[PDB]
Design a protein around this nucleic acid. Structure first.
Ligand code: ZN
Ligand code: ZN
Ligand code: ZN
Ligand code: ZN
Lengths: 55, 56
DNA sequence: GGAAATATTATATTCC
DNA sequence: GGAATATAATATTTCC
């Protein structure tokens, strides 16, 4: 499960290529109101709670 | 800039950003939690952590 | 201009 | 075991 780029290795594959996105620049999670893109869903979840809501 | 870390020699824009960075070497965690005793290297990191403790 | 806060990003660690 | 939550470091933005 080792990073082909930085010689780091994790216990899971899911953790492995969340890490890869820090190398390849892939950012699959996108904010509906803003267009800014993130590497993980939790990040965008944090960044989303900064846009004022409307419900 | 003029402010360089004496451990990793990465330069920082302003001395106050350097003193926070040095805490990532010394392990000095000044800011402590009122409810749970967990110590944090910055006031901000303590804020995002404190704001989940249900109610005081 | 510089300190402080806020937003950001990567990852370890719980959760499910 | 993947997904969520917490976390730590720093880049960006706000305030002064
Ligand atoms: Zn890597
Ligand atoms: Zn947005
Ligand atoms: Zn350093
Ligand atoms: Zn606490």
């Amino acid at each position: 499960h080792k990073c082909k780029y930085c010689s780091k290795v994790f216990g899971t594959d899911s953790s492995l290529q969340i890490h890869l996105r820090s190398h390849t620049g892939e950012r699959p999670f996108v904010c509906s109101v803003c267009g800014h893109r993130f590497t993980t869903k939790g990040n965008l979840k944090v960044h989303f709670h900064r846009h004022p809501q409307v419900k």
